[PDB]
Amino acid sequence: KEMPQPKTFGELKNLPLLNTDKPVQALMKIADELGEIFKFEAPGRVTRYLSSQRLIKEACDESRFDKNLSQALKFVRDFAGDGLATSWTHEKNWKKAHNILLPSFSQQAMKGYHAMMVDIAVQLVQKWERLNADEHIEVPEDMTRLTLDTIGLCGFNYRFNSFYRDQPHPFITSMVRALDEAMNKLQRYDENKRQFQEDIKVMNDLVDKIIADRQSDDLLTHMLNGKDPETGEPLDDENIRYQIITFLIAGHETTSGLLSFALYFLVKNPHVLQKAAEEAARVLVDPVPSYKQVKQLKYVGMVLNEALRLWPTAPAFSLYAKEDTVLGGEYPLEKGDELMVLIPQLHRDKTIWGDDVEEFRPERFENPSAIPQHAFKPFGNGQRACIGQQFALHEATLVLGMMLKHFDFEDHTNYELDIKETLTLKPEGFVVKAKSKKIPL
Amino acid sequence: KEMPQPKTFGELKNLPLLNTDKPVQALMKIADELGEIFKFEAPGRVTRYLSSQRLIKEACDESRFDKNLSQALKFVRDFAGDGLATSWTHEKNWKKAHNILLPSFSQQAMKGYHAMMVDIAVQLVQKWERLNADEHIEVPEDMTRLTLDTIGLCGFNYRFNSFYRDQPHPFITSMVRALDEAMNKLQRDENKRQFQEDIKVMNDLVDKIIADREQSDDLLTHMLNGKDPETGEPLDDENIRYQIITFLIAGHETTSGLLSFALYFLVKNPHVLQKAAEEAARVLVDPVPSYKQVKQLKYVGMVLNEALRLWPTAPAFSLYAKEDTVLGGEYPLEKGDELMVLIPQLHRDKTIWGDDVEEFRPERFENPSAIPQHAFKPFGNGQRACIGQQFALHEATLVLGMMLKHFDFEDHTNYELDIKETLTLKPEGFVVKAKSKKIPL
């Protein structure tokens, strides 16, 4: 009945607990201390952080809870607009864009993106093939180069050419700085405001120019030529721009974090790495992986799912109660009460996964049938789940599969896991050496 | 390219090689002579027996190979119907029953079965506690009493009361006779009448029990109230009867073999027995083991896995190629070509386990990541893997843990391993003496 609550800060209540550079991990330690649910209060804000599958399976009842825009999503909405990720379910543009964009994100649609994914993946492999001896790989940086370029290429046929850059493309600097200012608003400036508005324009300018500039096998074509079957309407240019920005943000950093965490866990678990490398070598028999071959990388996907279990890179999503309801038979929620799903804690629910929740064992996912309902939510829930899941998983499987095929990896620094937190999670400073296996492309 | 083949018998080809009372062991010796794969020909039948992890890891690719009904499963289907074990993957009732029954077989579901498992396990312990001096235990017999009663109780809330019997319950007598006739058809009018009499005896009780069935914590409840999420449809009563029969076959005989082989290997490896006994004594601190305590019986679980390695009691499963495919880069298979996975041979692949493949070393399973992919398939593969695996392992871990806690065991006859072969494997005539440790329940 009585809901736990972490330490308060007088008038600021719990909000200064988010005044930290690792708020998800701070929220996880609070959840470790307080359990499956704890009230988090701030001035003018009350939310509840769910950490058990028991409560989250109820939160994932779409008849009772709908996606809420967390404060982070509302700040991302300042430039992602009514794009898919930052729109309310009841906004016309969500379901409209959902229906228009769902076919271009199916498992059937990955066949058309695969060649462009391979394009960037080959650039990643070639970059590492071209490293000198004792030179190392900055993993999250290269993973971000790879995923951002992949979504740029697969999304609207735009080459950010991140592997040709030290400082990212001006759009990327603005997007990250806009995302940074959005996150700093959580923890919370006239200069930051002007910069944010400048970064919004930089982002808008490039996308709207690309929408104006633009048939290819990319999301942009589907958004210009796609009609929502329901309303019969195509997305207007403004929403198309919000979707591209949405896809640029949503589709690069969570996927790079997953790859970066996957490789981190691979180099920390040589048995898993060997097992995944053996599959990559066995399955990727061609110089260029095919779509079908990426599907055969079962264990690689198992590695990716276990990396998503330990560190879901989009580490939370928000829900609101559509009507007065009771959560778990002891937490009454009024209409509009907000819930936060602490995904990394959910994925450490010992009552679901056993006591070895902190162990990286992809064998947990050997049979996806053994996973209870709503125990594993790295891609959100229901109709508001990640539309790019298949895209992210296909890209990450392909790229990790190519990485494992072409290189032996060394944790040469014995890297101490340091999870930098933006709105996503990444192992900061994670560096490896890759000894090429000298397998041509 | 050319596939080895064991000796032929003219028009009967290889089939008379199965006219033997230990055909798996005959197939293993053939595999020892011919290697990782050999063609097995019969009138109107060609199959290939795989024995290496190298080929079986490919056979376990579900995109290329699906479960085939072996001739044994086709004969078991004559009374197990389209139950889970004897249905094709493409049969609507498989995935339907698979989806409905999967939650009632999860590791999360074992918490609710645990009390009934303890119920039968205590009955086993009490039987041995009540043995007089110099009286011995007929191990597979008592293990079958335990596993049959456990699946009867956990599955349908029906007490076979096998520990109150010398001659098994009439359903079990008919089932064993039915499985025998099913196996005897492999080696090949009164049989048929007898085979039909055993089917009717099995159907009548189950359909009665299904008709008689109150809400219980059993599989029958879940099957009566469970809806397939996919089709929204519940299992019809006919399939429920097939599932109960399936669980009555599948749910005990392989598990009793595992317990019997586990204890056989423990009394043949006193250090392993001591180590497992010490863990049982350390972990099982209560008179009644808890679910959590059974999970802490790591070495006992490792003991069971190594017993399943040496003698997987479901010793084979059949696969067919869904499309034209190449096995191991040198054995072209056409669409519908059949594969048999000779599991005990797989589990003796020296390239996986080392030269000591024949040794009972439970330590091989301390880390499941250090085991190559598809090297260990005692519970089948993929979506057609054993749905009762966690059930079998939890029951066997609990029961073996209680056995190790409550008794010192003596291989008083220096029992010579004699493996009776039905459709499962059991150490026939395996007898032990148990000196009670006088630890109350």
Ligand code: HEM
């Ligand atoms: C490992 C990689 C990824 C992870 C962990 C991830 C995670 C998530 C999560 C948890 C949500 C739910 C957000 C919420 O409920 O507030 C979401 C939504 C979304 N994601 Fe992803 N995502 C990944 C990759 C991608 C990619 C590659 C794309 C695009 C190419 C993408 C586009 C989207 C969109 C558009 C939504 C909103 C869907 C809707 O509300 O209709 N994501 N993602």
Ligand code: HEM
């Ligand atoms: C040590 C004990 C056990 C072993 C070694 C074992 C082994 C296996 C194997 C190898 C398969 C695959 C069959 C094939 O592919 O043709 C299988 C399937 C199956 N087993 Fe088990 N089993 C055990 C215990 C159990 C228990 C306790 C249950 C039920 C309570 C059970 C029920 C089933 C079912 C229903 C299937 C078919 C699943 C499907 O195809 O959807 N088994 N088992």
